[PDB]
Scaffold this active site. Structure first.
Site, PDB file in Angstrom:
ATOM      1  N   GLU A 192       0.824  -1.214   0.000  1.00 31.07           N
ATOM      2  CA  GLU A 192       0.000   0.000   0.000  1.00 31.07           C
ATOM      3  C   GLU A 192       0.860   1.267   0.000  1.00 31.07           C
ATOM      4  O   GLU A 192       0.554   2.213  -0.723  1.00 31.07           O
ATOM      5  CB  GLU A 192      -0.942   0.029   1.202  1.00 31.07           C
ATOM      6  N   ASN A 252      -7.835   9.488  -5.406  1.00 32.56           N
ATOM      7  CA  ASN A 252      -8.664   8.562  -6.162  1.00 32.56           C
ATOM      8  C   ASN A 252      -9.546   9.314  -7.153  1.00 32.56           C
ATOM      9  O   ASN A 252      -9.762  10.518  -7.040  1.00 32.56           O
ATOM     10  CB  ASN A 252      -9.560   7.743  -5.234  1.00 32.56           C
ATOM     11  N   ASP A 305     -12.782   9.332  -7.599  1.00 36.37           N
ATOM     12  CA  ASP A 305     -13.959   9.977  -7.024  1.00 36.37           C
ATOM     13  C   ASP A 305     -13.612  11.227  -6.222  1.00 36.37           C
ATOM     14  O   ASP A 305     -14.517  11.880  -5.690  1.00 36.37           O
ATOM     15  CB  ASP A 305     -14.754   8.963  -6.179  1.00 36.37           C
ATOM     16  N   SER A 340     -11.758  11.383  -3.437  1.00 36.54           N
ATOM     17  CA  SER A 340     -11.232  11.063  -2.125  1.00 36.54           C
ATOM     18  C   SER A 340      -9.719  10.841  -2.224  1.00 36.54           C
ATOM     19  O   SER A 340      -9.152  10.756  -3.311  1.00 36.54           O
ATOM     20  CB  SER A 340     -11.929   9.821  -1.574  1.00 36.54           C
ATOM     21  N   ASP A 347      -6.307   8.653  -0.223  1.00 35.23           N
ATOM     22  CA  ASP A 347      -5.802   7.628   0.691  1.00 35.23           C
ATOM     23  C   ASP A 347      -4.560   8.135   1.430  1.00 35.23           C
ATOM     24  O   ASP A 347      -3.698   8.788   0.832  1.00 35.23           O
ATOM     25  CB  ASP A 347      -5.412   6.362  -0.082  1.00 35.23           C
ATOM     26  N   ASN A 363      -8.830   5.645   3.475  1.00 33.88           N
ATOM     27  CA  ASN A 363      -9.541   6.508   2.533  1.00 33.88           C
ATOM     28  C   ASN A 363     -10.450   7.540   3.196  1.00 33.88           C
ATOM     29  O   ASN A 363     -11.189   7.224   4.133  1.00 33.88           O
ATOM     30  CB  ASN A 363     -10.388   5.643   1.604  1.00 33.88           C
TER      31      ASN A 363
END
Ligand SMILES: [Cl-]
Ligand SMILES: [Cl-]
Ligand code: NA
EC number: 3.2.1.17
Length: 129
Positions: A35, A46, A48, A50, A52, A59
């Site tokens: 990750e 991301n 959309d 958002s 991380d 998220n």
């Protein structure tokens, strides 16, 4: 902070993740490797809108507040910037909520695709725990 492999295993071990909800420590170290490459300061945006955050790429659409994900939740009740600290406490405490929510570690796409069903114990081999 960029952790070493065994250094992170010990810190995660010291914060209660070994066999938490049945996931052995190697699962958590493997997930952090793919990750964030063990970097507490990692961020990724991301599609959309958002973002991380941190060593486990938590998220902002559900778990933390970053002030720029409209209509999102803050289920861990923290600013997302707390997840970038060299102290991994906030990330571990939020991860415990995530893995308890019914879907286990499948919440982490890199765990599903790169750790699940592999010899995860290899990620803590040689470490002193
Ligand atoms: Cl393990
Ligand atoms: Cl599970
Ligand atoms: Na949010």
């Amino acid at each position: 902070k960029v952790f070493g492999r065994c250094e992170l295993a010990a810190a995660m071990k010291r914060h209660g993740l070994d066999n938490y909800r049945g996931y052995s420590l190697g699962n958590w170290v493997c997930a952090a490797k793919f990750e964030s490459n063990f970097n507490t300061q990692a961020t990724n945006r991301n599609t959309d809108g958002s973002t991380d955050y941190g060593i486990l790429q938590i998220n902002s659409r559900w778990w933390c507040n970053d002030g720029r994900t409209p209509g999102s939740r803050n289920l861990c009740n923290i600013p997302c910037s707390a997840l970038l600290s060299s102290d991994i406490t906030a990330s571990v405490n939020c991860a415990k909520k995530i893995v308890s929510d019914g879907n286990g570690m499948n919440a982490w796409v890199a765990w599903r695709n790169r750790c699940k069903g592999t010899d995860v114990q290899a990620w803590i081999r040689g470490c002193r725990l």
